[PDB]
Amino acid sequence: TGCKPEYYYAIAKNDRIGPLGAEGLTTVWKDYSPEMTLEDTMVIASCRDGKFMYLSRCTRETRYLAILHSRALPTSVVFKKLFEGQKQGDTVEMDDDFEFGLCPCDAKPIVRGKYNTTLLNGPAFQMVCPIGWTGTVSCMLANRDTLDTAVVRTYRRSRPFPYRQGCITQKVLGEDLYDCILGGNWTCVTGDQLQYSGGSIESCKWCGFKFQRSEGLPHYPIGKCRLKNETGYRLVDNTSCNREGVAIVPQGTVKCKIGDTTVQVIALDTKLGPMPCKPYEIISSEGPVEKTACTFNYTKTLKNKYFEPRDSYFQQYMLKGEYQYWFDLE
Amino acid sequence: TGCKPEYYYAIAKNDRIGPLGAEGLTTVWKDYSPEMTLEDTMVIASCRDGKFMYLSRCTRETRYLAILHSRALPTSVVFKKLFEGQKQGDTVEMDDDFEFGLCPCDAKPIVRGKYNTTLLNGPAFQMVCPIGWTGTVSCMLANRDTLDTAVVRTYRRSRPFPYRQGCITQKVLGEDLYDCILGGNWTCVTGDQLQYSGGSIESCKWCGFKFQRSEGLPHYPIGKCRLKNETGYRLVDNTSCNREGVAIVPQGTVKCKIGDTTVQVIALDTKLGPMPCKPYEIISSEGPVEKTACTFNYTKTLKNKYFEPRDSYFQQYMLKGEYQYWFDLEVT
Numbered sequence: 183t184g185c186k187p188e189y190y191y192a193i194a195k196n197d198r199i200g201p202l203g204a205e206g207l208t209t210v211w212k213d214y215s216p217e218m219t220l221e222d223t224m225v226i227a228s229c230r231d232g233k234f235m236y237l238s239r240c241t242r243e244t245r246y247l248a249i250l251h252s253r254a255l256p257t258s259v260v261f262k263k264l265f266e267g268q269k270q271g272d273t274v275e276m277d278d279d280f281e282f283g284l285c286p287c288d289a290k291p292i293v294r295g296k297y298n299t300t301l302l303n304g305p306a307f308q309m310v311c312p313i314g315w316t317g318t319v320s321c322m323l324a325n326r327d328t329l330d331t332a333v334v335r336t337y338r339r340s341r342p343f344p345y346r347q348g349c350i351t352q353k354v355l356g357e358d359l360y361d362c363i364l365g366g367n368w369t370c371v372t373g374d375q376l377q378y379s380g381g382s383i384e385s386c387k388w389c390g391f392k393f394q395r396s397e398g399l400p401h402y403p404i405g406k407c408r409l410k411n412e413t414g415y416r417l418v419d420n421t422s423c424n425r426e427g428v429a430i431v432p433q434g435t436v437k438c439k440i441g442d443t444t445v446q447v448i449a450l451d452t453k454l455g456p457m458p459c460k461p462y463e464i465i466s467s468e469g470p471v472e473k474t475a476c477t478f479n480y481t482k483t484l485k486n487k488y489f490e491p492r493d494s495y496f497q498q499y500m501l502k503g504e505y506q507y508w509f510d511l512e
Numbered sequence: 513t514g515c516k517p518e519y520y521y522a523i524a525k526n527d528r529i530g531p532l533g534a535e536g537l538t539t540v541w542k543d544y545s546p547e548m549t550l551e552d553t554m555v556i557a558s559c560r561d562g563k564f565m566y567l568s569r570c571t572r573e574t575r576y577l578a579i580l581h582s583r584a585l586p587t588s589v590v591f592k593k594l595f596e597g598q599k600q601g602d603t604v605e606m607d608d609d610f611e612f613g614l615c616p617c618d619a620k621p622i623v624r625g626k627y628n629t630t631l632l633n634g635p636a637f638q639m640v641c642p643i644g645w646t647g648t649v650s651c652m653l654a655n656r657d658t659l660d661t662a663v664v665r666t667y668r669r670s671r672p673f674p675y676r677q678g679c680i681t682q683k684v685l686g687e688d689l690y691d692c693i694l695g696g697n698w699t700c701v702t703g704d705q706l707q708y709s710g711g712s713i714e715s716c717k718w719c720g721f722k723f724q725r726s727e728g729l730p731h732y733p734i735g736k737c738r739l740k741n742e743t744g745y746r747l748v749d750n751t752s753c754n755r756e757g758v759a760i761v762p763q764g765t766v767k768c769k770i771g772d773t774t775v776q777v778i779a780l781d782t783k784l785g786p787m788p789c790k791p792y793e794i795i796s797s798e799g800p801v802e803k804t805a806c807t808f809n810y811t812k813t814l815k816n817k818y819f820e821p822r823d824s825y826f827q828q829y830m831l832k833g834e835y836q837y838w839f840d841l842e843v844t
């Protein structure tokens with residue numbers, strides 16, 4: 183547990199003792215030194231602050247600290263087990279708050295899970311926002327000549343990782359704000375669109391057009407809306423773009439207005455029905471852009487009674503009170 | 513018996529002889545003459561060839577021929593019964609061409625028939641154009657103040673008289689040609705208007721208006737039409753003047769035209785329907801009579817789709833193709 187001045191120290195692979203002394207020494211016998219270090223392929227032994235501290239580099243074989251007095255017989259060696267060795271490797275069960283892991287023996291981490299959440303750098307790996315993640319991390323050693331693989335450590339997560347603090351579990355896809363069913367931050371997996379619960383609204387999107395006020399619309403908020411506190415759109419309504427056989431569509435035949443927003447519409451039926459908007463531009467007959475002269479012929483008739491023919495322009499009998507009209511346009 | 517030169521002749525009601533001679537004489541004593549005629553209310557005695565022939569004018573009382581010689585006593589009178597008095601009436605069945613009848617015994621003809629077609633003068637009567645007539649003519653004689661009535665003869669026509677030549681069986685009433693259902697000439701009975709037949713029509717009169725051409729009308733000929741041949745109108749049809757729910761009437765509210773004819777019409781319902789005519793008068797907006805300034809606002813829309821509000825003047829969404837119109841009319 184501590185380095186003593188009149189003792190010899192070494193690292194051992196076994197506890198056995200023979201006629202010439204301890205068996206299985208991995209290092210040579212080293213005299214006491216303040217800060218003295220013993221080194222082999224598996225461990226680094228350091229004499230620090232009058233205390234014995236260790237740093238494992240590999241755990242494939244069991245290691246001991248061998249102690250022998252300078253005056254004593256070489257067969258009087260004392261061993262202190264540092265760690266038990268397993269060639270197939272140690273199996274670590276990842277706890278709920280597990281984040282960082284280091285693969286021993288300079289092994290490469292091989293991740294087998296629900297979705298990739300791991301950041302990898304040499305033998306080091308990082309589980310980034312593993313919310314709902316299950317699977318294993320296998321520390322593997324390859325061979326340049328034989329091409330055989332050996333496992334030195336297995337990190338396992340049987341049941342899903344619970345919710346983790348400091349993880350954004352909402353992601354913008356295009357302009358729509360989606361929920362992260364699994365993961366967080368960049369490890370996020372898209373589920374469904376987030377729904378409007380409350381809060382201040384920046385704008386709303388309905389039938390492919392943007393609105394910031396209720397005027398002209400059936401109601402407000404409508405369709406999907408973006409909060410002043412977010413960059414994406416949350417789903418508010420499922421309201422139909424089809425109104426009286428008149429469907430508001432981003433690529434429409436005729437332009438008209440809903441409040442301040444210019445809207446495009448298409449006819450679904452040729453029935454007599456209203457437009458779900460207000461006129462885009464009202465052109466005058468005497469207007470500078472277009473000149474069209476108006477003249478009309480009229481006669482006396484009985485109420486709701488018509489004479490032949492039907493107005494050339496309107497294709498209908500123009501009747502008001504006890505009079506019939508026939509217009510002539512430029 | 514015959515007449516002889518040295519005898520006197522007379523007509524008698526009886527065979528009785530008194531101290532002064534014959535007592536039932538109806539005529540005066542007449543001397544022999546070659547055509548000698550004796551006349552009374554019942555008989556006409558004529559000695560045509562020296563041989564007597566008779567013509568009865570009544571048979572209710574018995575008549576005798578009284579003969580008396582010029583040299584003999586007036587009580588030596590001889591009587592020859594001409595006929596026995598028959599108090600029962602005769603019954604004549606009027607033939608198809610029967611026209612004149614004479615009531616015997618100077619009786620008055622009493623006519624009981626379908627309609628009045630008889631000309632009457634004393635006992636004489638005349639059936640004037642009796643086409644379809646049925647009934648009886650009773651020759652009646654009333655005596656003193658008894659009030660008793662006696663039928664001397666009955667003229668009967670059980671089945672109707674057939675059509676008779678030389679009788680006009682069509683009469684004009686105002687301007688319409690009517691058919692004479694019974695009679696003819698002045699005895700005519702008119703009940704229905706003559707139905708049209710033939711090729712040449714002068715003019716038609718439907719709903720109180722005159723037409724000479726098919727233009728504007730439902731069809732032609734229509735209503736009552738006059739032939740080039742006649743003065744009156746003949747019935748062609750009963751077609752309604754109520755065209756839809758609009759009536760064509762001689763005294764109407766609004767004037768309009770059917771062909772060349774100016775027609776007057778009245779509304780019977782306010783339901784959306786057509787006028788059965790063409791406009792009478794077409795007044796222009798820029799016309800000299802009246803001036804009306806026309807201006808309009810328009811926008812693009814979808815077919816049969818409207819924007820608010822309705823046209824102020826038309827109280828309707830003015831839509832043509834993909835354009836909506838709003839008119840502004842101002843009187844000048």
Ligand SMILES: *[C@@H]1O[C@H](CO)[C@@H](O)[C@H](O)[C@H]1NC(C)=O
Pocket residue numbers: 298299300301302
């Ligand atoms: C999975 O994880 C690695 C580590 O961040 C990342 O670079 C890689 O792009 C991921 N795979 C995909 C296809 O997103």
Ligand SMILES: *[C@@H]1O[C@H](CO)[C@@H](O)[C@H](O)[C@H]1NC(C)=O
Pocket residue numbers: 310311348349350367
């Ligand atoms: C997730 O992102 C936020 C904001 O960039 C950051 O504060 C947080 O540390 C990230 N979480 C992890 C586990 O990297």
Ligand SMILES: *[C@@H]1O[C@H](CO)[C@@H](O)[C@H](O)[C@H]1NC(C)=O
Pocket residue numbers: 380381409411412
């Ligand atoms: C503000 O935005 C955050 C996400 O950045 C969201 O979780 C929160 O619910 C929003 N605030 C309100 C009041 O809805």
Ligand SMILES: *[C@@H]1O[C@H](CO)[C@@H](O)[C@H](O)[C@H]1NC(C)=O
Pocket residue numbers: 627628
């Ligand atoms: C003609 O006939 C009518 C109807 O029967 C009758 O009232 C009228 O008195 C008759 N007139 C003559 C002149 O016979």
Ligand SMILES: *[C@@H]1O[C@H](CO)[C@@H](O)[C@H](O)[C@H]1NC(C)=O
Pocket residue numbers: 640641678679680697
């Ligand atoms: C009817 O009148 C016509 C014309 O005057 C005449 O020829 C005819 O004899 C008349 N018939 C009778 C029976 O009155």
Ligand SMILES: *[C@@H]1O[C@H](CO)[C@@H](O)[C@H](O)[C@H]1NC(C)=O
Pocket residue numbers: 709710711739741742
């Ligand atoms: C005219 O002709 C019709 C037959 O088409 C005939 O009934 C009518 O009596 C004729 N009139 C004259 C005056 O000839």
